[PDB]
Amino acid sequence: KQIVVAGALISRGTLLVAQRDRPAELAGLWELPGGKVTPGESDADALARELREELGVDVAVGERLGADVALNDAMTLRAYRVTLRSGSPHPHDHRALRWVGADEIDGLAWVPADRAWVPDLVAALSG
Numbered sequence: 001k002q003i004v005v006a007g008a009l010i011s012r013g014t015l016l017v018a019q020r021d022r023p024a025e026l027a028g029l030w031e032l033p034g035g036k037v038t039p040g041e042s043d044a045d046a047l048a049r050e051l052r053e054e055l056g057v058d059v060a061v062g063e064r065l066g067a068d069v070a071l072n073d074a075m076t077l078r079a080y081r082v083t084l085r086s087g088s089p090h091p092h093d094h095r096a097l098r099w100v101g102a103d104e105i106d107g108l109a110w111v112p113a114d115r116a117w118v119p120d121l122v123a124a125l126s127g
């Protein structure tokens with residue numbers, strides 16, 4: 001399987017979520033930002049690269065957040081906790097970003113794959 005990595009960036013007690021702009025089926029729906037691992041890259045390399053490109057931030061990649069998600073035949077989607085090293089996130093590829101708290105998680109219009117992590121994200125923001 002091709003691995004797609006995604007980041008749960010928690011800062012000052014809130015989670016960053018990113019509103020996709022493409023393709024039509026997902027445009028307007030919310031995700032943890034990330035992207036495909038390239039051959040030879042570690043998950044950490046890939047996720048840090050994607051978030052630098054997508055958000056303009058330097059992050060440190062930490063523990064897994066939740067379980068793998070079967071995207072399709074070809075792909076598996078993995079989330080990791082990430083934390084900010086430098087920069088402020090801006091939507092270079094996305095329609096919008098938002099900082100959300102625990103009680104906003106389950107009401108967001110998630111992209112279908114990522115919705116699996118809702119309980120994990122609520123827990124990560126709870127307490």
Ligand SMILES: Nc1ccn([C@@H]2O[C@H](COP(=O)(O)O)[C@@H](O)[C@H]2O)c(=O)n1
Pocket residue numbers: 004005006031032033034035036071077111113114
């Ligand atoms: N949080 C994410 C990030 C990506 N993806 C999927 O991973 C693939 C590659 O991600 P990008 O489209 O963001 O490059 C896409 O097919 C997208 O549907 C996802 O389902 N959830």
